[PDB]
């Protein structure tokens with residue numbers, strides 16, 4: 001338990017920021033390794049909420065060290081804002097990978113241009129419009145500018161101009177205020193240059209010094225560029241392989257993987273959602289659990305828990321233990337449905353376990369098979385122990401553990417750091 | 425040793441195809457998981473050479489199963505050619521990921537367009553012009569077409585047209601024969617559709633059935649999009665994290681990692697090369713070891729072995745054992761230089777161990793520090809045992825093991841499958 005990875009097993013917003021903040025009480029380093037500001041991780045202490053998009057969620061601890069890995073696409077403008085918002089001496093314990101890619105405002109513009117075009121074609125992805133996809137695209141084309149370059153403003157200014165001019169031409173972006181963004185980056189250069197370091201060595205050194213590292217996942221498994229519901233996914237690797245490729249440490253350094261699983265499902269953006277509840281039950285889940293995008297404020301689509309999805313994710317990420325979150329939101333429902341299988345509406349055959357119809361046109365052929373679970377009316381946000389929970393909640397929890405053959409260690413019963421039940 | 429990954433630790437062409445073919449004698453499945461046809465893996469049996477670019481190098485065994493993972497960008501046209509070239513009943517044991525991206529001819533066109541533009545700017549990468557970068561770019565933008573779609577020709581044809589029209593407009597490609605490529609893909613559809621399957625489940629099932637899996641790396645660590653000498657790198661993850669993200673299996677499934685290290689260095693394409701020998705010694709290495717691109721036929725740049733590079737790669741990929749290749753090529757040199765450190769020419773300070781100046785402008789400031797090793801004149805391509813090798817060769821080998829704190833298990837003394845010494 002010296003090197004722990006927290007990975008969402010669904011379509012994000014499973015409660016990653018919450019467990020990171022909680023576990024950061026006993027961790028030395030907390031790292032982000034993929035995506036960028038599309039991520040929205042909410043921390044809540046005594047009901048005072050804090051939302052992070054680029055900095056890891058261990059920032060509330062004066063001693064915690066924040067690390068942004070090489071696998072990220074960083075909107076430096078947003079980064080600076082979060083840094084100053086945290087304040088204190090955060091900079092003295094901030095380590096920004098000199099290999100991470102810089103996400104400029106033009107990346108966001110292209111993101112919107114692409115989405116606008118697709119909207120007219122009726123195939124928009126519903127991205128967060130934070131320019132994530134376009135930044136990973138320039139990374140692939142290898143014209144993206146990485147953080148290390150920002151350490152030398154002279155060289156940076158020159159490279160910056162060429163990338164922007166190239167992109168403006170490529171996407172016909174007629175006007176972009178290069179002078180304004182450039183001057184802003186000078187400020188970024190001044191305040192961040194000494195914090196742009198070799199995270200590879202920093203990680204190896206600290207691991208050798210027996211430091212405890214918390215790896216914060218962004219987005220989630222079903223949004224993985226490769227394994228998610230393509231094209232309705234993010235453009236980075238959000239799965240376990242990404243912990244190594246996005247941070248610069250090898251597989252033997254990872255001690256365990258915590259899968260963050262919400263008691264019910266949500267996804268925000270377009271794409272398939274087999275157990276989607278576009279009715280009053282969905283409204284109940286969204287309102288009681290206030291399911292609105294931490295980043296875009298968009299209303300999240302809600303639905304029932306999906307077991308086949310989790311078996312698929314277990315194959316991909318491996319899951320040592322589960323953090324079952326927002327169980328408290330299900331309080332009040334007379335019945336809870338658990339999707340334990342998918343049946344093909346055309347052939348009548350059941351979907352093979354471990355398989356998942358990620359493709360929109362294949363998903364369409366499946367019908368969910370539900371197991372009925374009696375609900376509970378008690379407010380469980382006050383429960384401190386597993387045994388204190390009403391019986392019907394226990395059965396739900398136990399049923400989940402059984403089907404996934406994975407232990408549920410942390411039960412979430414509220415957005416606050418304290419609202420967590422530990423199942424010894 | 426049930427699940428083994430073979431990863432090049434330098435800039436490719438370390439002899440991966442050779443060890444894959446060798447080890448495939450005792451493996452059930454051999455998988456490719458990254459890149460595409462930019463890779464050129466040479467197999468040699470009784471001096472008859474075979475070069476693969478997309479199919480794994482286990483194809484010479486009538487019982488071996490070939491797997492192409494989700495993380496690849498596949499030029500289907502080239503794939504079909506290699507399939508038919510192998511012949512036999514290869515199709516009955518070919519498993520193509522339905523998640524892998526299809527690389528069209530237009531991807532190659534864009535690759536050349538981009539390189540031509542950069543050439544005029546004096547910053548060409550020197551890509552293999554196989555359209556790899558542009559295909560990973562369309563993957564990131566999520567408009568790329570994946571193999572699964574090819575199973576339904578009706579749907580494929582329609583999606584194909586839209587991607588090509590979009591790209592033609594984007595890059596002003598005025599003429600592209602859509603009808604010709606389309607009709608060719610119909611043929612691909614017919615002969616490959618039933619082989620386009622769920623590799624995720626196939627892998628999990630076979631691993632559960634105790635099948636022995638060989639994971640064939642493409643390109644190499646120093647060409648890794650994140651960890652390599654950016655922008656002079658390939659656009660896929662060529663490191664260990666990529667084995668998981670490109671194949672759909674988790675980190676606990678990997679039993680060991682073999683690092684393929686050439687006795688000297690080569691790289692083909694532009695970019696930094698600290699120990700480069702652009703002189704007669706370089707010519708000796710290139711001619712004796714016939715260092716010409718397996719894919720492009722371009723002459724490979726040659727230089728001395730680089731220890732700091734390997735310590736860096738060990739941090740990234742982890743190395744359980746090393747396959748030191750082409751030691752036979754060094755026969756005849758009066759002296760062999762091993763780069764054991766890098767000294768900053770400006771400050772006079774030594775580069776920290778485990779660190780590597782990947783950036784062109786930072787690399788420029790370093791000077792290699794060499795350790796002199798006496799050479800040997802004997803032809804060692806006949807040596808069958810480690811003890812049979814001349815003493816000076818042993819010292820070189822032993823010196824390498826010592827500095828990397830990693831055992832050298834397989835010594836290559838010839839291009840043929842048999843030309844391998846096992847160091848018990």
Ligand SMILES: Nc1nc2c(ncn2[C@@H]2O[C@H](COP(=O)(O)OP(=O)(O)O)[C@@H](O)[C@H]2O)c(=O)[nH]1
Nearest residue numbers: 013014015016017041042294326412413414415
């Ligand atoms: N009621 C309730 N809310 C929770 C619980 N855990 C987290 N939340 C809240 O649920 C929301 C999840 O959204 P978000 O923070 O974007 O998820 P993340 O991306 O995984 O960090 C946040 O507003 C959290 O404060 C829980 O156990 N119960």
Ligand SMILES: Nc1nc2c(ncn2[C@@H]2O[C@H](COP(=O)(O)OP(=O)(O)O)[C@@H](O)[C@H]2O)c(=O)[nH]1
Nearest residue numbers: 437438439440441465466718750836837838839
């Ligand atoms: N002399 C010699 N040649 C070798 C040895 N191992 C491999 N080769 C040859 O070296 C070349 C390496 O190029 P390539 O096949 O592209 O490397 P790969 O990408 O790692 O498979 C090939 O032509 C091999 O046949 C060895 O031990 N000695």
Ligand SMILES: O=P(O)(O)OC[C@H]1O[C@@H](n2cnc3c(OP(=O)(O)O)ncnc32)[C@H](O)[C@@H]1O
Nearest residue numbers: 012013038039040127128218219233234268269
């Ligand atoms: O190109 P993008 O901007 O990444 O959009 C692609 C798709 O992915 C969704 N998405 C991306 N990051 C997400 C997130 O992250 P966290 O759990 O870390 O807070 N939580 C929920 N949904 C998320 C977007 O809504 C869209 O459908």
Ligand SMILES: O=P(O)(O)OC[C@H]1O[C@@H](n2cnc3c(OP(=O)(O)O)ncnc32)[C@H](O)[C@@H]1O
Nearest residue numbers: 436437462463464551552642643657658692693
């Ligand atoms: O966009 P790309 O076409 O990938 O080019 C980017 C850079 O990477 C090099 N390169 C790519 N794959 C390579 C390879 O693979 P294997 O060891 O698998 O045979 N061996 C050697 N060099 C290789 C190219 O020459 C270029 O410098």
Ligand SMILES: O=CN(O)CC(=O)O
Nearest residue numbers: 040293294295296297
């Ligand atoms: O927490 C982030 N999301 O839920 C995504 C969004 O806000 O769109």
Ligand SMILES: O=CN(O)CC(=O)O
Nearest residue numbers: 464717718719720721
């Ligand atoms: O084996 C492939 N290479 O060496 C790359 C090339 O041919 O350019």
Ligand SMILES: [Mg+2]
Nearest residue numbers: 013040041294
């Ligand atoms: Mg979120």
Ligand SMILES: [Mg+2]
Nearest residue numbers: 437464465718
């Ligand atoms: Mg090669």
